Design a protein around this ligand. Structure first.
Ligand code: FDA
Ligand code: A2P
Length: 296
């Protein structure tokens, strides 16, 4: 039935009332000092106890209590490592986390609870995890699929997951031969997350991988408009539209809730030109499992 790799997945092996307690291995800042805000890549040991698949998320229960003396609510994080992991032994899990900092109503600076707890982790520290969670973002079963990946900021996480499996690993029963096209929206060149990894993949599989960046604060289109991901998409409109008409094309979108609208704004117009109602078409794609979304 499913077009996705849904068979034999684990879900909620670990729950909030009984989390898995793993330890931090590494925690590294991956953005430049230049960047607006910090993004960290961190890796935790789970010794093989969390049997996740690419596209899933884990919950993190940050240490401390809420204002009622209760444990904090879990926050979800997309897994940024493939099922084997960054060390290739299936015993670790990696997260890509932005440090959240804001000012409240009174001009006071507020730190996000889980995000700062995580970004401040030192190797050796323990962490409470739950999950795995999710089915929405699992990869398609078709090894020859066209997969378009639309991410903003940390939303690159699941795509990193997919791509490590696809291009940096050897699997007995899986060999990717389709076309993978990634579009990644970040603010600055010093925020191009995992670029070095993607450049290595591109060299390995030149015919199978396409890569496009939309550096919002540094790039403008012809009209001198800000280079959002949708902005960069339009430059490929005809092509993308055509890909969308095929049954073996899968779209995945992950990141800021805001990107969803912008994309719909470009699509409405693309389709109307062919006399198609984007809203119905999209509904059909969602149902056929070809249009997959995880925004937050
Ligand atoms: C499915 C899915 C998957 C992911 C994520 C969410 C979900 C649902 N997230 C987001 C993550 O779960 C979490 O919400 C953030 O890390 C922030 O949590 P803290 O506990 O740090 O903030 P905390 O919960 O302390 O504060 C959050 C609150 O900040 C407030 N806020 C934010 N900006 C504000 C502003 N400008 N002004 C006023 N108030 C403001 C809002 O009130 C908001 O509810 C994520 N994140 C991530 O970094 N990487 C990832 O991979 C993922 N993956
Ligand atoms: N509504 C939106 N649609 C598309 N891209 C967006 C939207 N809002 C913000 N962005 C961009 O998503 C990226 C998020 O990356 P990061 O987490 O490091 O900030 C930035 O390039 C940000 O651009 P900008 O902040 O210049 O508006």
């Amino acid at each position: 039935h499913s077009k996705k790799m849904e068979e034999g997945i684990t879900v909620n092996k670990f729950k909030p009332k009984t989390p898995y307690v793993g330890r931090c291995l590494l925690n590294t800042k991956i953005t430049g000092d230049d960047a607006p805000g910090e993004t960290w890549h961190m890796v935790f040991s789970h010794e093989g106890e969390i049997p996740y698949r690419e596209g899933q998320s884990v919950g993190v229960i940050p240490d401390g209590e809420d204002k009622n003396g209760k444990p904090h609510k879990l926050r979800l994080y997309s897994i940024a490592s493939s099922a084997l992991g960054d060390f290739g032994d299936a015993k670790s899990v990696s997260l890509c986390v932005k440090r959240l900092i804001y000012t409240n109503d009174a001009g006071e600076t507020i730190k996000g609870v889980c995000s700062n707890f995580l970004c401040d982790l030192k190797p050796g520290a323990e962490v409470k995890l739950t999950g795995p969670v999710g089915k929405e973002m699992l990869m398609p079963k078709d090894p020859n699929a066209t997969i378009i990946m639309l991410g903003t900021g940390t939303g690159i996480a699941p795509f990193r997951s997919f791509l490590w499996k696809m291009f940096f690993e050897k699997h007995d029963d899986y060999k990717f031969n389709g076309l993978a096209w990634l579009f990644l929206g970040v603010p600055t060149s010093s925020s191009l997350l995992y670029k070095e990894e993607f450049e290595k993949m591109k060299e390995k599989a030149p015919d199978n991988f396409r890569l496009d960046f939309a550096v919002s604060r540094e790039q403008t289109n012809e009209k001198g408009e800000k280079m959002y991901i949708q902005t960069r998409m339009a430059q490929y409109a005809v092509e993308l539209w055509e890909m969308l008409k095929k049954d073996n094309t899968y779209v995945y979108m992950c990141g800021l809730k805001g990107m969803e609208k912008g994309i719909d704004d470009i699509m409405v117009s693309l389709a109307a030109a062919e006399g198609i109602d984007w809203i119905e078409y999209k509904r059909q794609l969602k149902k056929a499992e070809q249009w997959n979304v995880e925004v937050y």
